[PDB]
Amino acid sequence: YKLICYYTSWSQYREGDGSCFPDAIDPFLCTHVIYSFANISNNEIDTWEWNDVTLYDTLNTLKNRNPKLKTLLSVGGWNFGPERFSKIASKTQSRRTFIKSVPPFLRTHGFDGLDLAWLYPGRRDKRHLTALVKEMKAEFAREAQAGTERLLLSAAVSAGKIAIDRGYDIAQISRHLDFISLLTYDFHGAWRQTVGHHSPLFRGNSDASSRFSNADYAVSYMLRLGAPANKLVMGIPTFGRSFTLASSKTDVGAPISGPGIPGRFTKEKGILAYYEICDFLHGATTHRFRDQQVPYATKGNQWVAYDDQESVKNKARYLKNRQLAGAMVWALDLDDFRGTFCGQNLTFPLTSAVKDVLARV
Template identity: 40%
Template sequence: MLLYAAVLVTVLSFAAASEKKVVCYHGTWATYRSGLGQFDVTDIDPHLCTHVIYSFVGINDQGEVISLDPYVDLPSGKNAFRNFNALKKINPKLKTLLAVGGWNEGSSKYSTMAADASLRANFVKSALNMVLTYGFDGFDLDWEYPARRDTTHGDADVDNFTTLIKELRVQFDKYGLLLSAAVSPTSATASLSYDIPSISKYLDFINVMTYDMYGPWEAVVLHNSPLHRGEGQENEAREDVNSADVSLDYWLSQGCPPEKLLMGVPFYGHTFKLADASQSSVGAPSAGAGIAGPFTQEAGIIGYNEFCDMLQTQSWDVRYDPKAKVPYAVLGNDWVSYDDVDSMAKKVEYAISRGIGGVMLWSIETDDFHGICGEKFPLLNTINRVMANQIPTTKPTVAPSTAKPTVASSTSTTNKPSSTVSTTASISGICSKLGPTRNPADCSTYYMCVYDRSGGISPILMHCPKYTYWDQKHLYCNYLHETDCKV
């Protein structure tokens, strides 16, 4: 029983032990959505994220950080700044950050501010004041993007952005505050905006926005956030494809420390109108933006909470791109690229395999937070479950058998872990080293080899997600046709 308890604590403490991050952005405008789409900061489950980021504040012409929606943000209105930070009373380990910028803020104001020493000083001082006044643990820069869009100073933005981050770092270090940034994912875009080795020195973590890779602005239908090069792209050079793996390769190759790098995952999909309903495969001609969600109400984009309900109530043809590792769905002329629980698991497994700092998600209010399609927060719970199956890189400090597991979990009673502790932990010959390995008797499961209480290595039985099987070649759960499963 002591061995069983020790291994259980070890398994359930993987995410905490390895300090992998689950960074959750929250778009506060969701408070204005109607019906089941309305989402306030108090709807956030603070046990499912290691960090939550309040989005967004902006700046004025003096470079000062200001509220963009005083009614929502400030004590005179809905007091969301303070309610957001009150989540730490529920989970004291939670870290809160305040994000500045975003797509709608544009680039020009930030380009002007970053180029002027006095305006930068105003920015740094006002940012620090807002963070300290309302109890945030840090600040997130979401300038979209240096040296791009409506920039006023062009290429000079690159060095000015580095200078701004350095000046923030100096002041934030006096109070032990976090500093992060959301950044463009691809080499074609990031190479224009960032001095990656320099900004990596001053930022605590970097959120790579590996979504919006393709969308209804394209002439053909393609995936919002492919993990790898997808169907129809076989003849394209890998480095020319927009995909999460290529983006991570680029950021790592440019000197970003892996422990600071976070892979972005979307809790929304892109919608298209097919030019011809008879041509509906990946890469088919597009006629532009498709359906809008009932809550987000924007053509070309749909929240997971909106689309999963449509999948239950309408006759969509759901398909899977085995190369890109993401699903898509077709109904008449409508074509939707999105992520589901299985593709989310694949992405997190891949992020872990690359040894990076964790994942970032945009954004928490478009998960199925009411559980309309099943459990509450299914995408976010999937991220946590996969994170919980990580391998410790050093021998764990074994807690007493009475210790309670600390893995993040939803308050929903429908949650079920995706792994179980094997009652045959003494099986000989299964584990020759730390890490995952096949179960010779059943390829819908596999063994995770971890340190046990005595300092030896013991196997723990793990279960692959539904419809997937263990792939010993790649060391993750995969679709049947891509494995050598014979059982």
């Protein structure tokens, strides 16, 4: 089984214990570690943070301890505009320029592959996404002739049905990608005023609409569209999504006034790192959706939908039972990487719980 783990560039800037450097990563925890995110300047792959070359170097030294470890650099991300990806992929000339700049960059910094995070391709983009993937793969095969191990090519894909039908030719890109990470955790649309879980495993027998918004449907659908199970990787969040309640009602369908207040270290309305959630739990009321199989908590006017060791182990067993290629974790820096916030003196409790399940066959 594969254990794909993301590390974010900006996590280095968090205060105190929140600060996380590649250096804090257990070399034997994951099979693949993806650095997020690379940028695109003058139609060429480029660094993002001022100290990326230094951090790139720090992350890739981990392979001195675990020779089997594979690293990839991810391009795109949610802060990188989709229009930019769209513009580059639409013109064969700007697309070929981008493609050619990649292998040399990956080789200079010691990466074993490239991860595509175009979020997201629209109706007019579908055909070009396919061309981009296909041509990028062809360049990697051509570059391997130089005698060095062929670079890997992956992509992070939306788990929402409408998004899938709109911009992806799954059957086509599946044959060129080494693996596909399903983003099965942004299911509760940032649009409306209700409380809900962002990463439920199952539908939840007490609802009619949006049967599409849960990991199980997304996986089944991808398999139905043509994606082979041995190339599919299921995303498991290491963060939670918070809400500020508009009333004293704390259960399903309860009214929402907006995102939950920022975390002390994460400082971003709407989300909390798992290590922040562990602190938040003290004095909170914990509940669990039996049907969906995921937990949530409340304290004051704050409502949090998250994943714990149990929900995460549960998702890992599901993935195995369906014979998928493995799991993807977003993100190492949001897990209790120091092992000092969540009780158990265990480092990376969430990612470890997944690994343990994956290891038992």
